[PDB]
Design a protein around this ligand. Structure first.
Ligand SMILES: *[C@@H]1O[C@H](CO[C@@H]2O[C@@H](C)[C@@H](O)[C@@H](O)[C@@H]2O)[C@@H](O[C@@H]2O[C@H](CO)[C@@H](O)[C@H](O)[C@H]2NC(C)=O)[C@H](O)[C@H]1NC(C)=O
Lengths: 214, 217
């Protein structure tokens, strides 16, 4: 019944920069506000309680202010390990306790080209009847990359999947894994397999390939 | 050393019943409330309910009242979250958290989470395959055909020591099953000047842990 609103929705800032997040209440909630941090794939973590009190064990660069309807979280000097999603929460109108929608924070760094590796299907996997080809990109920035499969120079489509890692907590880079799946039949019909990568840090598309024999 | 530890991942079919657990340690379980929070896949946090383990007085959210039930067992210092007929909408992550009631309330300690997956599928353990390249060499491991998506990787040398150059990629869904990969980087020198010709990939999963040797070219 109390609506909590956060701003901005997402943001990207450099190490050492100041990050400012605002949380607004639909009606006075005195100092009944808390701030949480949720790094991806892990449980939230209390940072500030009672609007401006630093939970023990939280870096001193975190701080909060406000009362009534306006509150503000501040990271005085952003650090590489602070990439996360930040939530505010209200503890005045019980029930129900209400959260904000969240604010995603990313670390900005310098462009970095990816290292590329390709892997053929294992003979063990092939006797079972399916062939999976894999293509890995390591330590690149920004996140935007485009992987591209070719079998005998014929472009593939709708037969591959991929996933991307979180930002590394020291160097702020990303990595990516992509998998081309074919039937054992189709795999031994063609010979040359390749993944072609496109990224800002590459002045020209990079290709990695192997031949079915060797 | 405050600590809340929850039950493992689950796979249930629409209409079944389920009970999750959340056990506390390192503090008097009966001096703090226990709250449950839900996070739909890819969305934010939603407050579900409370229980005071001292007297078991519960307070639910209007959204969830009726469809879910909260209980506790202070003798074993544990709290529970229960469904009677599970629905597809209930597929999400569920967190328990210790709550303070003295003055301004706050959730000061959280559990690791329980993944609840509601589908027509049936659980299965992963199947492992090695990944070998056809001044540092890369070697990997591929897991396939497992459900739920609750998997962990680890590597070991031939001398059962630990390899710390691990790399973790999210899973992907395909025909009701998940697949994932992992890679490691090894110094080019150390391998040539060496008598080890393999390394060991390990995965942990609710329905079965499994190992697989990986050749070194
Ligand atoms: C256990 O083995 C590791 C790794 O050595 C592996 O086995 C070799 C034969 C070869 O296959 C290497 O490529 C592998 O890395 C040992 O760790 C390394 O040991 C070498 C010894 O020459 C040393 O120069 C490196 O710096 C070590 N690297 C690391 C990351 O530790 C490890 O010492 C062995 N453990 C025991 C208990 O003997």
């Amino acid at each position: 019944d109390i609506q909590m609103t956060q701003s901005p929705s997402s943001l990207s800032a450099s190490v050492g920069d100041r990050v400012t997040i605002t949380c607004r209440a639909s009606q006075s909630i005195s100092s009944y506000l808390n701030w949480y941090q949720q790094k991806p794939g892990k449980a939230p973590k209390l940072l500030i309680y009672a609007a401006s009190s630093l939970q023990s064990g939280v870096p001193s660069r975190f701080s909060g202010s406000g009362s009534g309807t306006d509150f503000t979280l501040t990271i005085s000097s952003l650090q590489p390990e602070d990439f996360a999603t930040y939530y505010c929460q209200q503890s005045y109108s019980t029930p129900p306790h209400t959260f904000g929608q969240g604010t995603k924070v990313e670390i900005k760094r310098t462009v970095a080209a990816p290292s590329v590796f390709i892997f053929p299907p294992s003979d063990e996997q092939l006797k079972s009847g399916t062939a999976s080809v894999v293509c890995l990109l390591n330590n690149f920035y920004p996140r935007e990359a485009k992987v591209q499969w070719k079998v005998d120079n014929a472009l593939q489509s709708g037969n591959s999947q991929e996933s991307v890692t979180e930002q590394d907590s020291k160097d702020s880079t990303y990595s990516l894994s992509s998998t081309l799946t074919l039937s054992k039949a189709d795999y031994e019909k063609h010979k040359v397999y390749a993944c072609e990568v496109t990224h800002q840090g590459l002045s020209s598309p990079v290709t990695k390939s192997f031949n079915r024999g060797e | 050393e405050v600590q809340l530890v929850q039950s493992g991942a689950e796979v249930k079919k629409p209409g079944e019943s389920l009970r999750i657990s959340c056990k506390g340690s390192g503090y008097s379980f009966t001096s703090y409330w226990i709250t449950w929070v839900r996070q739909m896949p890819g969305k934010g946090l939603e407050w579900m309910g409370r229980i005071d383990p001292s007297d078991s007085y519960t307070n639910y959210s209007p959204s969830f009242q009726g469809h879910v039930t909260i209980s506790a067992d202070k003798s074993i210092s544990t709290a529970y979250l229960q469904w009677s007929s599970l629905k597809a909408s209930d597929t999400a992550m569920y967190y328990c958290a210790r709550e303070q009631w003295l003055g301004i309330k706050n959730f000061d300690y959280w559990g690791q989470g329980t993944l609840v997956t509601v589908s027509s599928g049936s659980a299965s353990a992963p199947t492992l395959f090695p990944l070998v390249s056809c001044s540092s060499v890369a070697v990997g491991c591929l897991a396939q055909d497992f459900l739920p998506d609750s998997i962990t990787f680890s590597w070991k040398y031939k001398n059962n020591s630990d390899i710390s150059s691990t790399r973790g990629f999210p899973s992907v869904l395909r025909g009701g099953k998940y697949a994932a990969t992992s890679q490691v980087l090894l110094p080019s020198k150390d391998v040539m000047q060496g008598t080890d010709e393999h390394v060991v990939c390990k995965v942990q999963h609710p329905n079965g842990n499994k190992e697989k040797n990986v050749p070194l070219p």
